Amino acid sequence: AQLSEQLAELEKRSGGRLGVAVLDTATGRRIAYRGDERFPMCSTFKALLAAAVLARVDQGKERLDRRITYGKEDLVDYSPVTEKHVGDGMTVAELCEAAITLSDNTAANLLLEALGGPAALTAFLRSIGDEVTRLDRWEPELNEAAPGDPRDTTTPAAMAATLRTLLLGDALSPASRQQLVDWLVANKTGDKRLRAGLPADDRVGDKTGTGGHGTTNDIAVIWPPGRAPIVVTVYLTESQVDADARDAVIAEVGRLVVEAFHHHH
Ligand SMILES: O=[N+]([O-])c1ccc2nn[nH]c2c1
């Protein structure tokens, strides 16, 4: 209730459309602002993509140490890791790490190819119970973020529930689960979004995303000391303020989420 008004005030000053979901795993209870509205995912999809790959590894259809070869012509804009390994190539695990930790666009496209494309990612999501999130396009076309376009979107609540089952539930094997946590925890943003609003003593594994039509997102599983973990998803789009302002918007969601856990009662 109170956090809602605070977020709606924050949404006004952003000029855009803000969506937040908070899933407390101690109770399975969730708080949500536009939690059942569609928002463009941009790079936050890469957390799901590495999950779907690890699920192939669990099934035996993939190996984290499989070498993937690619040439200069497979590269798209923003490939900080993969661009320096056109010769060697990279293992699946190295592409997953590059995609989560640095948002390497070629890594994600290479992992989508190994998977079977946006439809295979969407198909995996369905198999774990997410009936909402959808990936339709490849990098970088999927960062369009056009209002009313349902392609490449999720909801704050759907994304939060999906992170819960992948990182904390029984969707992946325990080892794949631990591996996906390890990748998300070693973000190198790093960091100015949710991370910036939170207590430093927290262990945070997060994924950021940026797009057109004034879009910045951040999703995260947070482990507070001596406390069950909490899943926070934040989606901002149609924002009229600039990229640095959008970062501070997301950090302010983080601060408000903490205040409401400690004080609203
Ligand atoms: O992100 N959080 O929802 C959250 C809530 C309460 C907390 N106490 N410590 N860290 C926290 C994070």
Author numbering: 27 to 58, 60 to 238, 240 to 252, 254 to 294
What text comes from the article?
Here, we explore and test these notions using resurrected Precambrian β-lactamases11 as scaffolds for the engineering of completely new active sites. Of these systems, resurrected Precambrian β-lactamases have been thoroughly characterized in terms of their structure, function and stability. These putative ancestral proteins have been shown to be highly stable and able to efficiently degrade several antibiotics. A hydrophobic-to-ionizable amino acid replacement generates a buried (or partially buried) residue with the perturbed properties that are useful in catalysis and conformational flexibility assists the generation of a completely new active site by facilitating substrate and transition-state binding. We have shown that, when using resurrected Precambrian β-lactamases as scaffolds for protein engineering, a minimalist design approach based on this mechanism leads to levels of catalysis for the Kemp elimination reaction of up to approximately seven orders of magnitude above the rate of the uncatalysed reaction, as well as to significant ester hydrolysis activity.
Specifically, X-ray crystallography in the presence of 5(6)-nitrobenzotriazole, a known transition-state analogue of the Kemp elimination reaction and inhibition by this analogue support that Kemp elimination does occur at the site generated by the W229D replacement. Following from this, 3D-structure determination in the presence of the transition-state analogue confirms the role of conformational flexibility in the generation of a new function, as transition-state binding is shown to rely on conformational rearrangements. Specifically, the bound transition-state analogue is displaced with respect to the position originally occupied by the tryptophan 229, as required by the presence of an aspartate residue at position 229 in the active variants. Such a displacement is made possible by a shift of the h11 α-helix (and the concomitant shift of the substantially solvent-exposed h1 α-helix). We note also that the catalytic efficiency for the Kemp elimination in the engineered ancestral proteins correlates with the transition-state analogue binding constants derived from inhibition experiments, supporting that catalysis is linked to transition-state stabilization. We subsequently performed MD simulations in the presence of the transition-state analogue 5(6)-nitrobenzotriazole (TSA) to explore the impact of transition-state binding on the conformational dynamics, as well as how well each system could accommodate the transition state in its new active site. The W229D variants of the ancestral scaffolds that give rise to substantial Kemp elimination activity (PNCA, GNCAMP and GNCA4) can accept the TSA in the MD simulations, although the TSA dissociates from the less active W229D variant of the PNCA scaffold after about 50 ns.
